[PDB]
mmCIF file of C-alpha atoms and ligand atoms in Angstrom:
data_model
loop_
_atom_site.group_PDB
_atom_site.id
_atom_site.type_symbol
_atom_site.label_atom_id
_atom_site.label_comp_id
_atom_site.label_asym_id
_atom_site.label_seq_id
_atom_site.Cartn_x
_atom_site.Cartn_y
_atom_site.Cartn_z
ATOM 1 C CA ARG H 1 12.830 -9.158 5.574
ATOM 2 C CA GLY H 2 14.335 -6.350 3.405
ATOM 3 C CA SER H 3 11.186 -4.969 1.606
ATOM 4 C CA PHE H 4 7.906 -3.896 3.195
ATOM 5 C CA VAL H 5 6.024 -2.072 0.375
ATOM 6 C CA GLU H 6 2.727 -1.860 2.303
ATOM 7 C CA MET H 7 4.395 0.024 5.225
ATOM 8 C CA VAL H 8 6.346 2.528 3.044
ATOM 9 C CA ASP H 9 4.797 6.022 3.270
ATOM 10 C CA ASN H 10 2.504 5.066 6.216
ATOM 11 C CA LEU H 11 3.412 8.281 8.090
ATOM 12 C CA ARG H 12 1.861 11.764 7.680
ATOM 13 C CA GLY H 13 1.985 15.105 9.547
ATOM 14 C CA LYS H 14 2.580 18.842 9.595
ATOM 15 C CA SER H 15 5.857 20.675 10.313
ATOM 16 C CA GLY H 16 6.208 21.033 14.050
ATOM 17 C CA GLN H 17 3.168 18.749 14.779
ATOM 18 C CA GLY H 18 4.935 15.419 14.514
ATOM 19 C CA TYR H 19 4.552 12.159 12.588
ATOM 20 C CA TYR H 20 1.451 10.012 12.906
ATOM 21 C CA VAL H 21 0.422 6.552 11.762
ATOM 22 C CA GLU H 22 -3.124 5.305 11.193
ATOM 23 C CA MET H 23 -4.363 2.782 13.818
ATOM 24 C CA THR H 24 -7.633 1.011 14.584
ATOM 25 C CA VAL H 25 -8.912 0.313 18.077
ATOM 26 C CA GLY H 26 -11.894 -1.772 19.154
ATOM 27 C CA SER H 27 -14.515 -4.036 17.556
ATOM 28 C CA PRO H 28 -15.721 -2.915 15.130
ATOM 29 C CA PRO H 29 -12.438 -0.950 14.322
ATOM 30 C CA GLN H 30 -12.375 2.732 15.189
ATOM 31 C CA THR H 31 -9.830 4.602 13.019
ATOM 32 C CA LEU H 32 -7.467 7.044 14.693
ATOM 33 C CA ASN H 33 -4.343 8.973 13.734
ATOM 34 C CA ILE H 34 -1.664 8.324 16.286
ATOM 35 C CA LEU H 35 1.601 10.268 16.926
ATOM 36 C CA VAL H 36 4.751 8.045 16.606
ATOM 37 C CA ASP H 37 6.677 8.606 19.808
ATOM 38 C CA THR H 38 10.025 6.878 20.753
ATOM 39 C CA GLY H 39 10.325 9.180 23.852
ATOM 40 C CA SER H 40 7.455 7.688 25.899
ATOM 41 C CA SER H 41 5.897 4.320 26.630
ATOM 42 C CA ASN H 42 2.073 4.727 26.907
ATOM 43 C CA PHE H 43 -0.514 4.084 24.248
ATOM 44 C CA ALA H 44 -2.800 6.990 25.103
ATOM 45 C CA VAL H 45 -5.774 8.054 22.923
ATOM 46 C CA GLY H 46 -8.397 10.824 23.134
ATOM 47 C CA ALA H 47 -11.603 9.315 24.544
ATOM 48 C CA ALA H 48 -13.656 12.489 25.129
ATOM 49 C CA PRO H 49 -14.902 15.267 22.713
ATOM 50 C CA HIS H 50 -12.104 17.789 23.145
ATOM 51 C CA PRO H 51 -12.686 20.590 20.540
ATOM 52 C CA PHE H 52 -9.223 20.119 18.928
ATOM 53 C CA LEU H 53 -10.004 16.491 18.081
ATOM 54 C CA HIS H 54 -11.197 15.159 14.713
ATOM 55 C CA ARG H 55 -11.908 11.656 16.165
ATOM 56 C CA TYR H 56 -11.843 9.948 19.564
ATOM 57 C CA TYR H 57 -12.049 6.447 21.061
ATOM 58 C CA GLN H 58 -15.607 5.599 21.981
ATOM 59 C CA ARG H 59 -15.314 2.662 24.366
ATOM 60 C CA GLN H 60 -19.111 2.101 24.417
ATOM 61 C CA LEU H 61 -19.014 1.088 20.732
ATOM 62 C CA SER H 62 -16.385 -1.634 21.293
ATOM 63 C CA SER H 63 -17.419 -5.212 22.167
ATOM 64 C CA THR H 64 -13.791 -6.239 22.831
ATOM 65 C CA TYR H 65 -13.114 -3.368 25.283
ATOM 66 C CA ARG H 66 -12.093 -4.457 28.789
ATOM 67 C CA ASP H 67 -11.953 -1.995 31.680
ATOM 68 C CA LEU H 68 -8.851 -2.301 33.884
ATOM 69 C CA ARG H 69 -10.591 -0.190 36.641
ATOM 70 C CA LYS H 70 -7.464 1.930 37.177
ATOM 71 C CA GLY H 71 -6.728 5.557 36.555
ATOM 72 C CA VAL H 72 -3.499 7.075 35.185
ATOM 73 C CA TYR H 73 -2.250 10.632 35.742
ATOM 74 C CA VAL H 74 0.592 11.954 33.534
ATOM 75 C CA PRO H 75 1.966 15.425 34.255
ATOM 76 C CA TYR H 76 5.090 16.229 32.112
ATOM 77 C CA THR H 77 7.260 19.312 31.526
ATOM 78 C CA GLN H 78 5.096 20.958 28.865
ATOM 79 C CA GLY H 79 1.585 19.719 29.736
ATOM 80 C CA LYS H 80 -0.671 17.054 31.241
ATOM 81 C CA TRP H 81 -2.918 14.156 30.400
ATOM 82 C CA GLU H 82 -4.998 11.777 32.508
ATOM 83 C CA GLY H 83 -7.115 8.777 31.666
ATOM 84 C CA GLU H 84 -8.704 5.454 32.407
ATOM 85 C CA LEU H 85 -6.799 2.286 31.675
ATOM 86 C CA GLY H 86 -8.250 -0.500 29.589
ATOM 87 C CA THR H 87 -7.473 -3.106 26.991
ATOM 88 C CA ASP H 88 -8.818 -3.585 23.429
ATOM 89 C CA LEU H 89 -7.970 -5.031 19.998
ATOM 90 C CA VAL H 90 -5.559 -2.877 18.070
ATOM 91 C CA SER H 91 -4.254 -3.140 14.461
ATOM 92 C CA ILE H 92 -2.136 -0.997 12.120
ATOM 93 C CA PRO H 93 -3.955 -0.850 8.616
ATOM 94 C CA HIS H 94 -0.634 0.024 6.864
ATOM 95 C CA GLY H 95 1.520 -2.157 9.103
ATOM 96 C CA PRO H 96 1.750 -5.929 9.833
ATOM 97 C CA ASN H 97 -1.321 -8.075 9.051
ATOM 98 C CA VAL H 98 -2.052 -8.699 12.824
ATOM 99 C CA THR H 99 -4.430 -7.814 15.649
ATOM 100 C CA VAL H 100 -3.148 -7.473 19.197
ATOM 101 C CA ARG H 101 -4.833 -6.914 22.607
ATOM 102 C CA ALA H 102 -3.041 -3.833 23.944
ATOM 103 C CA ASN H 103 -3.205 -1.573 26.959
ATOM 104 C CA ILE H 104 -4.987 1.700 26.063
ATOM 105 C CA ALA H 105 -5.103 4.786 28.247
ATOM 106 C CA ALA H 106 -8.394 6.495 27.410
ATOM 107 C CA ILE H 107 -7.715 10.211 27.807
ATOM 108 C CA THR H 108 -10.517 11.896 29.704
ATOM 109 C CA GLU H 109 -8.720 15.192 30.803
ATOM 110 C CA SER H 110 -5.689 17.028 29.373
ATOM 111 C CA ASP H 111 -3.892 20.346 29.274
ATOM 112 C CA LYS H 112 -1.559 21.624 26.454
ATOM 113 C CA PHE H 113 -1.475 18.001 25.194
ATOM 114 C CA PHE H 114 -3.535 18.047 21.960
ATOM 115 C CA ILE H 115 -2.397 20.562 19.332
ATOM 116 C CA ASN H 116 -4.974 22.976 17.954
ATOM 117 C CA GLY H 117 -5.053 22.348 14.215
ATOM 118 C CA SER H 118 -3.256 18.943 14.345
ATOM 119 C CA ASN H 119 -4.579 15.741 12.690
ATOM 120 C CA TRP H 120 -3.663 13.269 15.475
ATOM 121 C CA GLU H 121 -5.854 12.090 18.449
ATOM 122 C CA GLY H 122 -3.393 10.006 20.433
ATOM 123 C CA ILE H 123 0.236 8.938 21.034
ATOM 124 C CA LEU H 124 2.016 5.611 20.446
ATOM 125 C CA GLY H 125 4.624 5.368 23.179
ATOM 126 C CA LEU H 126 7.317 3.131 21.584
ATOM 127 C CA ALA H 127 9.927 3.177 24.443
ATOM 128 C CA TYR H 128 10.251 0.604 27.258
ATOM 129 C CA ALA H 129 8.092 -0.395 30.306
ATOM 130 C CA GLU H 130 10.391 1.263 32.873
ATOM 131 C CA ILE H 131 9.036 4.767 31.945
ATOM 132 C CA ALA H 132 5.422 3.642 31.413
ATOM 133 C CA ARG H 133 2.710 5.313 33.616
ATOM 134 C CA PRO H 134 1.609 4.502 36.221
ATOM 135 C CA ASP H 135 4.528 1.959 36.516
ATOM 136 C CA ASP H 136 6.436 -0.805 34.607
ATOM 137 C CA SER H 137 3.640 -3.357 34.969
ATOM 138 C CA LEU H 138 1.637 -1.575 32.206
ATOM 139 C CA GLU H 139 2.965 -3.432 29.175
ATOM 140 C CA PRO H 140 3.771 -1.010 26.271
ATOM 141 C CA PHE H 141 2.134 -1.606 22.863
ATOM 142 C CA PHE H 142 5.282 -2.877 21.070
ATOM 143 C CA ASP H 143 5.954 -5.381 23.872
ATOM 144 C CA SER H 144 2.339 -6.739 23.511
ATOM 145 C CA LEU H 145 2.809 -6.855 19.682
ATOM 146 C CA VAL H 146 6.020 -8.988 19.923
ATOM 147 C CA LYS H 147 4.601 -11.233 22.677
ATOM 148 C CA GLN H 148 1.329 -11.928 20.812
ATOM 149 C CA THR H 149 2.491 -12.249 17.241
ATOM 150 C CA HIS H 150 5.463 -13.447 15.121
ATOM 151 C CA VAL H 151 6.431 -9.814 14.359
ATOM 152 C CA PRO H 152 10.261 -9.491 14.959
ATOM 153 C CA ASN H 153 11.394 -7.304 17.868
ATOM 154 C CA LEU H 154 12.502 -4.379 15.662
ATOM 155 C CA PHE H 155 10.973 -1.238 14.120
ATOM 156 C CA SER H 156 12.515 1.497 11.901
ATOM 157 C CA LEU H 157 11.662 5.066 11.209
ATOM 158 C CA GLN H 158 12.218 7.283 8.191
ATOM 159 C CA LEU H 159 10.917 10.736 9.035
ATOM 160 C CA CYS H 160 10.880 13.049 5.988
ATOM 161 C CA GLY H 161 11.117 16.759 6.712
ATOM 162 C CA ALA H 162 9.879 19.904 4.863
ATOM 163 C CA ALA H 163 3.454 22.357 5.331
ATOM 164 C CA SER H 164 3.012 18.551 4.995
ATOM 165 C CA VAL H 165 5.558 15.971 6.016
ATOM 166 C CA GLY H 166 5.632 12.202 5.544
ATOM 167 C CA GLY H 167 7.703 9.025 6.071
ATOM 168 C CA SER H 168 7.737 5.361 7.001
ATOM 169 C CA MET H 169 7.447 3.227 10.112
ATOM 170 C CA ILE H 170 8.530 -0.280 9.213
ATOM 171 C CA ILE H 171 7.168 -2.560 11.891
ATOM 172 C CA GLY H 172 9.182 -5.821 12.290
ATOM 173 C CA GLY H 173 11.925 -5.025 9.807
ATOM 174 C CA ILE H 174 14.159 -2.843 7.689
ATOM 175 C CA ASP H 175 13.390 -1.575 4.138
ATOM 176 C CA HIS H 176 16.663 -1.049 2.198
ATOM 177 C CA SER H 177 15.046 1.404 -0.231
ATOM 178 C CA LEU H 178 14.731 3.927 2.599
ATOM 179 C CA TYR H 179 18.466 4.563 3.103
ATOM 180 C CA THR H 180 21.753 4.874 1.243
ATOM 181 C CA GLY H 181 25.215 3.548 2.282
ATOM 182 C CA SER H 182 25.546 1.381 5.398
ATOM 183 C CA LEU H 183 23.812 1.217 8.772
ATOM 184 C CA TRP H 184 25.990 1.931 11.731
ATOM 185 C CA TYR H 185 24.860 0.729 15.157
ATOM 186 C CA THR H 186 25.064 2.387 18.553
ATOM 187 C CA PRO H 187 24.301 0.372 21.760
ATOM 188 C CA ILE H 188 21.127 1.095 23.707
ATOM 189 C CA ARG H 189 22.728 1.852 27.067
ATOM 190 C CA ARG H 190 19.662 1.046 29.094
ATOM 191 C CA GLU H 191 16.103 -0.016 28.158
ATOM 192 C CA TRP H 192 13.949 2.791 29.460
ATOM 193 C CA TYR H 193 14.137 5.654 26.943
ATOM 194 C CA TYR H 194 16.172 4.755 23.794
ATOM 195 C CA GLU H 195 19.298 5.933 25.666
ATOM 196 C CA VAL H 196 22.531 6.324 23.721
ATOM 197 C CA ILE H 197 26.086 7.678 24.452
ATOM 198 C CA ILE H 198 27.527 10.673 22.500
ATOM 199 C CA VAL H 199 31.353 10.454 22.618
ATOM 200 C CA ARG H 200 32.361 13.542 20.524
ATOM 201 C CA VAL H 201 30.810 16.736 19.057
ATOM 202 C CA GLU H 202 32.099 18.611 16.021
ATOM 203 C CA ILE H 203 30.950 21.853 14.389
ATOM 204 C CA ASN H 204 32.246 21.855 10.792
ATOM 205 C CA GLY H 205 34.744 19.192 11.908
ATOM 206 C CA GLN H 206 35.963 21.475 14.760
ATOM 207 C CA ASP H 207 35.847 19.455 18.040
ATOM 208 C CA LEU H 208 34.001 21.202 20.932
ATOM 209 C CA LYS H 209 36.662 19.624 23.202
ATOM 210 C CA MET H 210 34.404 19.303 26.189
ATOM 211 C CA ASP H 211 34.535 16.424 28.784
ATOM 212 C CA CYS H 212 32.263 13.913 26.913
ATOM 213 C CA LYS H 213 30.261 13.352 30.054
ATOM 214 C CA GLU H 214 28.718 16.796 29.431
ATOM 215 C CA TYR H 215 27.267 15.534 26.129
ATOM 216 C CA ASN H 216 25.216 12.996 28.033
ATOM 217 C CA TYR H 217 24.324 14.940 31.258
ATOM 218 C CA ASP H 218 22.112 13.448 32.561
ATOM 219 C CA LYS H 219 21.162 11.233 29.512
ATOM 220 C CA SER H 220 21.047 11.204 25.699
ATOM 221 C CA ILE H 221 17.944 9.864 24.017
ATOM 222 C CA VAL H 222 16.477 9.309 20.488
ATOM 223 C CA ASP H 223 12.995 10.835 20.464
ATOM 224 C CA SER H 224 10.599 11.093 17.473
ATOM 225 C CA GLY H 225 8.113 12.937 19.811
ATOM 226 C CA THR H 226 10.450 15.954 20.167
ATOM 227 C CA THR H 227 11.035 18.529 17.336
ATOM 228 C CA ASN H 228 14.466 19.994 18.264
ATOM 229 C CA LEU H 229 17.974 18.811 18.797
ATOM 230 C CA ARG H 230 18.075 19.534 22.521
ATOM 231 C CA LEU H 231 21.499 19.836 24.154
ATOM 232 C CA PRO H 232 22.555 20.171 27.815
ATOM 233 C CA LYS H 233 23.040 23.869 28.764
ATOM 234 C CA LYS H 234 26.883 23.799 28.772
ATOM 235 C CA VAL H 235 27.020 21.918 25.453
ATOM 236 C CA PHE H 236 24.409 24.218 23.948
ATOM 237 C CA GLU H 237 26.348 27.451 24.727
ATOM 238 C CA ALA H 238 29.647 25.884 23.405
ATOM 239 C CA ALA H 239 27.825 24.785 20.212
ATOM 240 C CA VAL H 240 26.106 28.192 19.631
ATOM 241 C CA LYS H 241 29.470 30.009 20.137
ATOM 242 C CA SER H 242 31.039 27.737 17.460
ATOM 243 C CA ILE H 243 28.066 27.997 15.121
ATOM 244 C CA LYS H 244 28.116 31.872 15.472
ATOM 245 C CA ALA H 245 31.858 31.883 14.651
ATOM 246 C CA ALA H 246 31.400 29.670 11.555
ATOM 247 C CA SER H 247 28.385 31.615 10.262
ATOM 248 C CA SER H 248 29.844 35.142 10.983
ATOM 249 C CA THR H 249 29.581 35.989 7.231
ATOM 250 C CA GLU H 250 26.187 37.370 8.347
ATOM 251 C CA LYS H 251 25.326 38.721 11.824
ATOM 252 C CA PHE H 252 22.092 37.673 13.563
ATOM 253 C CA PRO H 253 20.358 38.981 16.688
ATOM 254 C CA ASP H 254 21.194 36.965 19.891
ATOM 255 C CA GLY H 255 17.505 36.180 20.245
ATOM 256 C CA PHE H 256 17.643 34.026 17.049
ATOM 257 C CA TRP H 257 20.116 31.647 18.682
ATOM 258 C CA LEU H 258 17.778 31.345 21.684
ATOM 259 C CA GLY H 259 14.786 30.553 19.410
ATOM 260 C CA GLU H 260 13.085 33.828 20.404
ATOM 261 C CA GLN H 261 13.311 35.277 16.822
ATOM 262 C CA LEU H 262 13.037 34.141 13.242
ATOM 263 C CA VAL H 263 15.487 35.043 10.467
ATOM 264 C CA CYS H 264 14.228 35.692 6.916
ATOM 265 C CA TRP H 265 15.763 35.699 3.437
ATOM 266 C CA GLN H 266 14.280 36.610 0.009
ATOM 267 C CA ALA H 267 12.525 33.589 -1.472
ATOM 268 C CA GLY H 268 14.889 30.773 -2.366
ATOM 269 C CA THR H 269 18.097 32.747 -1.501
ATOM 270 C CA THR H 270 18.768 31.073 1.935
ATOM 271 C CA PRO H 271 22.595 31.069 2.417
ATOM 272 C CA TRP H 272 22.927 27.398 3.491
ATOM 273 C CA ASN H 273 26.675 27.575 2.684
ATOM 274 C CA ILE H 274 27.412 30.042 5.562
ATOM 275 C CA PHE H 275 25.945 27.602 8.167
ATOM 276 C CA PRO H 276 28.170 24.728 9.523
ATOM 277 C CA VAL H 277 27.435 21.008 9.604
ATOM 278 C CA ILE H 278 27.011 19.351 12.990
ATOM 279 C CA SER H 279 28.576 15.960 13.800
ATOM 280 C CA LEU H 280 27.632 13.731 16.709
ATOM 281 C CA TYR H 281 29.997 10.817 17.337
ATOM 282 C CA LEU H 282 28.149 7.864 18.817
ATOM 283 C CA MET H 283 29.546 4.916 20.848
ATOM 284 C CA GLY H 284 30.120 2.048 18.354
ATOM 285 C CA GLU H 285 29.546 -1.687 18.667
ATOM 286 C CA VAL H 286 33.199 -2.518 19.341
ATOM 287 C CA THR H 287 35.567 -1.364 22.097
ATOM 288 C CA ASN H 288 37.348 1.915 21.234
ATOM 289 C CA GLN H 289 35.236 2.159 18.031
ATOM 290 C CA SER H 290 32.827 4.967 17.144
ATOM 291 C CA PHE H 291 30.941 6.408 14.128
ATOM 292 C CA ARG H 292 29.633 9.890 13.387
ATOM 293 C CA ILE H 293 26.330 11.242 12.193
ATOM 294 C CA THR H 294 26.384 14.649 10.425
ATOM 295 C CA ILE H 295 23.382 16.990 9.928
ATOM 296 C CA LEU H 296 23.055 20.174 7.727
ATOM 297 C CA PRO H 297 21.447 23.582 8.331
ATOM 298 C CA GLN H 298 18.508 22.096 6.303
ATOM 299 C CA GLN H 299 17.865 19.976 9.428
ATOM 300 C CA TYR H 300 18.485 22.524 12.227
ATOM 301 C CA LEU H 301 16.991 25.613 10.570
ATOM 302 C CA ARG H 302 13.295 24.734 10.356
ATOM 303 C CA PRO H 303 10.915 26.570 7.921
ATOM 304 C CA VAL H 304 8.211 28.746 9.585
ATOM 305 C CA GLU H 305 5.222 29.674 7.322
ATOM 306 C CA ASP H 306 3.399 32.746 8.716
ATOM 307 C CA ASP H 307 9.859 35.451 2.324
ATOM 308 C CA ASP H 308 11.632 32.315 3.560
ATOM 309 C CA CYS H 309 11.770 32.399 7.364
ATOM 310 C CA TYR H 310 13.403 29.964 9.769
ATOM 311 C CA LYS H 311 13.564 29.063 13.431
ATOM 312 C CA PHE H 312 16.839 27.871 15.061
ATOM 313 C CA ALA H 313 15.852 24.395 16.139
ATOM 314 C CA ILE H 314 18.771 23.588 18.432
ATOM 315 C CA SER H 315 17.903 24.481 22.070
ATOM 316 C CA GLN H 316 19.181 24.104 25.628
ATOM 317 C CA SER H 317 17.989 21.239 27.850
ATOM 318 C CA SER H 318 17.955 20.316 31.535
ATOM 319 C CA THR H 319 16.930 16.678 30.683
ATOM 320 C CA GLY H 320 20.099 15.852 28.701
ATOM 321 C CA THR H 321 20.529 15.483 24.934
ATOM 322 C CA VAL H 322 17.362 14.858 22.915
ATOM 323 C CA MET H 323 17.837 13.660 19.344
ATOM 324 C CA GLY H 324 14.480 14.849 18.064
ATOM 325 C CA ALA H 325 13.099 15.376 14.609
ATOM 326 C CA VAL H 326 16.096 17.650 13.793
ATOM 327 C CA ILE H 327 18.399 14.595 13.935
ATOM 328 C CA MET H 328 15.924 11.978 12.732
ATOM 329 C CA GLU H 329 14.932 13.818 9.550
ATOM 330 C CA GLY H 330 18.572 13.268 8.333
ATOM 331 C CA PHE H 331 18.541 9.517 8.885
ATOM 332 C CA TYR H 332 16.863 6.149 8.562
ATOM 333 C CA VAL H 333 16.743 5.008 12.220
ATOM 334 C CA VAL H 334 16.558 1.343 13.176
ATOM 335 C CA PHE H 335 15.318 0.544 16.644
ATOM 336 C CA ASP H 336 16.888 -2.899 16.883
ATOM 337 C CA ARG H 337 15.308 -3.908 20.237
ATOM 338 C CA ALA H 338 16.231 -7.606 19.757
ATOM 339 C CA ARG H 339 19.917 -6.674 19.756
ATOM 340 C CA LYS H 340 19.751 -3.653 22.159
ATOM 341 C CA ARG H 341 21.130 -1.265 19.490
ATOM 342 C CA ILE H 342 20.056 1.617 17.260
ATOM 343 C CA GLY H 343 21.168 1.815 13.577
ATOM 344 C CA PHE H 344 21.711 5.017 11.653
ATOM 345 C CA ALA H 345 21.991 5.412 7.878
ATOM 346 C CA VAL H 346 21.728 8.403 5.481
ATOM 347 C CA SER H 347 17.990 8.808 4.753
ATOM 348 C CA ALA H 348 16.880 8.454 1.092
ATOM 349 C CA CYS H 349 14.444 11.382 1.781
ATOM 350 C CA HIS H 350 16.614 13.894 3.787
ATOM 351 C CA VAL H 351 16.681 17.541 2.682
ATOM 352 C CA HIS H 352 20.040 18.676 1.280
ATOM 353 C CA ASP H 353 21.668 20.698 -1.529
ATOM 354 C CA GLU H 354 24.111 20.190 -4.406
ATOM 355 C CA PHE H 355 27.198 20.816 -2.136
ATOM 356 C CA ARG H 356 26.492 18.844 1.137
ATOM 357 C CA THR H 357 24.444 15.813 2.284
ATOM 358 C CA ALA H 358 23.734 14.321 5.707
ATOM 359 C CA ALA H 359 26.375 11.649 6.486
ATOM 360 C CA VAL H 360 26.928 8.471 8.537
ATOM 361 C CA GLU H 361 30.623 7.683 8.643
ATOM 362 C CA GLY H 362 33.015 5.201 10.422
ATOM 363 C CA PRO H 363 34.868 3.669 11.898
ATOM 364 C CA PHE H 364 36.706 6.089 14.189
ATOM 365 C CA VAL H 365 39.088 5.412 17.077
ATOM 366 C CA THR H 366 37.605 6.868 20.290
ATOM 367 C CA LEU H 367 38.991 5.912 23.808
ATOM 368 C CA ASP H 368 37.221 6.003 27.198
ATOM 369 C CA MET H 369 33.720 5.957 25.624
ATOM 370 C CA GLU H 370 32.264 4.366 28.817
ATOM 371 C CA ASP H 371 33.435 7.435 30.779
ATOM 372 C CA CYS H 372 31.032 9.559 28.590
ATOM 373 C CA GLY H 373 27.956 8.019 30.258
ATOM 374 C CA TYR H 374 26.517 9.792 33.296
ATOM 375 C CA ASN H 375 25.829 8.000 36.592
ATOM 376 C CA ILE H 376 23.666 9.155 39.477
HETATM 377 C C1 C6R S 1 4.266 12.119 25.049
HETATM 378 C C2 C6R S 1 5.235 13.257 24.869
HETATM 379 C C3 C6R S 1 4.584 14.226 23.913
HETATM 380 C C4 C6R S 1 5.095 14.598 22.612
HETATM 381 C C5 C6R S 1 4.494 15.482 21.771
HETATM 382 N N1 C6R S 1 5.092 15.721 20.589
HETATM 383 C C6 C6R S 1 4.846 16.600 19.623
HETATM 384 O O1 C6R S 1 3.894 17.291 19.602
HETATM 385 C C7 C6R S 1 5.798 16.643 18.426
HETATM 386 C C8 C6R S 1 5.740 17.710 17.558
HETATM 387 N N2 C6R S 1 6.650 17.790 16.510
HETATM 388 C C9 C6R S 1 7.553 16.779 16.292
HETATM 389 O O2 C6R S 1 8.483 16.801 15.266
HETATM 390 C C10 C6R S 1 8.368 17.778 14.196
HETATM 391 F F1 C6R S 1 7.325 17.479 13.313
HETATM 392 C C11 C6R S 1 7.585 15.699 17.188
HETATM 393 N N3 C6R S 1 6.685 15.627 18.240
HETATM 394 C C12 C6R S 1 3.227 16.115 22.133
HETATM 395 C C13 C6R S 1 2.672 15.827 23.364
HETATM 396 C C14 C6R S 1 3.216 14.907 24.240
HETATM 397 F F2 C6R S 1 2.640 14.706 25.438
HETATM 398 N N4 C6R S 1 6.451 12.673 24.195
HETATM 399 C C15 C6R S 1 7.630 13.158 24.121
HETATM 400 N N5 C6R S 1 8.570 12.501 23.464
HETATM 401 S S1 C6R S 1 8.024 14.581 24.899
HETATM 402 C C16 C6R S 1 6.707 15.088 26.018
HETATM 403 C C17 C6R S 1 5.666 13.954 26.184
HETATM 404 C C18 C6R S 1 5.993 12.948 27.278
HETATM 405 C C19 C6R S 1 7.145 12.184 27.322
HETATM 406 C C20 C6R S 1 7.408 11.255 28.363
HETATM 407 C C21 C6R S 1 6.471 11.116 29.344
HETATM 408 C C22 C6R S 1 5.278 11.837 29.364
HETATM 409 C C23 C6R S 1 5.049 12.789 28.350
#
């Protein structure tokens, strides 16, 4: 506990393509790069020679492969994958010194799922069984890991932003070299997604003053498998209005705020100072107690290489708040499953300037925080 040198820097990727970890599957071990995804619950790997794929799982080569004789069909908002369920032996080379028998969905057909030019061949769904396909009886990888080994029921993520990105997934613990200051914990409201409650939103310390239920309509989640900070429609328009007001030193086309246009500045002359900070107050551990996380334009204006051009990476949502890479790149994030809570601390690797840094601050007095959660 406290130091996991072998797991530091075990994540790689490209901007906009996500963060992957090296895994092995089968006997003998077949090496695959696997997207780290806290917003889903399936371990699903390429099993057929799709042209975008560097590598794929070849079940015929594995002596420890067991066919579950069951299909799985996963349409989602932005694509589709389908596969054949099985089990096999799985290890993480730059993770704990263990081997686990895990459920594997062998992907046999997909659409808009694999990224052309990416270096990953599968997805590690790190959320809970309730959202696993086809149903909650398919035990997620991390559940299998904890059940079969002495690995503590905790993992933590340091996602380091920017073409190449990196970071750390500490499996079974916390590495104190990855953050500065203190960890502040928010309750996991329900174990399906990593669902949290946002109690207050500020743009440059100016409260949006919305009914806090709007912030979590219909949920708020922490998702390493999403790029943007996604906000419910009503919250998004309030936030953009305020961000526009604060940044009115320079005028931008309306399309930029909708992510339909890039904005460019002469190399290394990006006016970070004109753009406001964004604070999300999260439900704390104690009644009437909250803390806030604060991100910079360096997090929400993402570099696009095609002199210095940027995409606005805050976007409107109909699925509730999604705290994607935009949020997570500011913070060391502790998924403390054992204690049903998520910890946030200022990341040792977050992108900032000489004037401002990302911040995790508390405690604050916030009443009626339970009222902020949405119920069907
Ligand atoms: C499995 C799923 C998913 C995610 C991605 N992610 C990415 O490509 C990506 C790109 N850049 C990032 O940061 C910047 F570097 C982060 N991630 C790609 C394909 C996918 F199918 N995970 C989700 N959380 S959202 C939809 C989907 C999903 C979720 C739930 C149920 C089914 C499918």
